UniProtKB/Swiss-Prot annotation:
The keyword Transferase applies. Its EC number is 2.1.1.233. GO terms for cellular component: cytosol; nucleoplasm. Keywords: Methyltransferase, S-adenosyl-L-methionine, Transferase. This is Leucine carboxyl methyltransferase 1. GO terms for biological process: C-terminal protein methylation; G2/M transition of mitotic cell cycle; negative regulation of protein-containing complex assembly; protein methylation; protein modification process; regulation of apoptotic process; regulation of glucose metabolic process; regulation of mitotic cell cycle spindle assembly checkpoint. It catalyses: [phosphatase 2A protein]-C-terminal L-leucine + S-adenosyl-L-methionine = [phosphatase 2A protein]-C-terminal L-leucine methyl ester + S-adenosyl-L-homocysteine.
Amino acid sequence: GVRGTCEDASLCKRFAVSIGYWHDPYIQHFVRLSKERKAPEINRGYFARVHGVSQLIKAFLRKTECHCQIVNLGAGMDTTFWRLKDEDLLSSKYFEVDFPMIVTRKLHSIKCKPPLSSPILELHSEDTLQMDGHILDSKRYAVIGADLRDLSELEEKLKKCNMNTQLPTLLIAECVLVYMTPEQSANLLKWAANSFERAMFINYEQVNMGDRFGQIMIENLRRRQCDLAGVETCKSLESQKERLLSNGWETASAVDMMELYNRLPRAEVSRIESLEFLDEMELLEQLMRHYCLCWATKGGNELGLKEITY
Ligand SMILES: Nc1ncnc2c1ncn2[C@@H]1O[C@H](CSCC[C@H](N)C(=O)O)[C@@H](O)[C@H]1O
């Protein structure tokens, strides 16, 4: 069930892109275009998610002048590496982690499609990519098959791909931590904090899950054999912040997605709202109030990391 979320996320993102929510010429190479009608509330939610996460990544890249690493944990078919390259934003090295099966799928897409492999090769120090098995390693981009609940495997394979614990490092978990136990996600967060002197962590996932709407969401996901093993932490923005502060992080900010959406520039909101008609604002408000964007920093005072916002 948990691996299946990668496909769902990719399917939803490509669909939103096809309607014009944001620009992504790469996602087509990793997933088919869904053909059925969706709630516009869902597309707006995906846009807010992607925008918020992107804003935070770009703020980190500005503060570090791109002299840094990005590690995307549970990255699925994310295209952020290619989209950043196009914007002339390239970290020193960009790392992705997912289950071996998911990584195999992603490497197959890259190997089959020159629009994906070429940009990687352009920046590499060799005239070829070694992509056998569950690892792609290159100068500026690595994709690693590892179970995030096995921290020894995670660290070993990241270090095999020359992850440098001395660079300011941004770690991202976009709709990932909720699938592991509270102990497993806490251990991951603590591992990250212990590993890096100067760091930032972005967590996007559910929030306010104790109410009826949240209980219904949980059961709809348990109905598809996909348990929200970490949903306890999604009680509130407070429980989200506490998990960060109690596992080695120095700062913790969190916002629900409705507030984020309400704080978007007027131009972005007008553009977004132009794409599809939405009849009842309350379904939207409800959905947006049950997701959150959280970020934590440590050792960032010289870089001004605690000043980063969405
Ligand atoms: N224990 C674990 N180890 C490695 N990957 C995991 C994991 N638990 C969940 N994942 C991955 O987390 C992803 C959740 S779907 C979200 C994908 C991507 N971050 C996006 O936002 O578009 C899936 O690809 C799933 O395989």
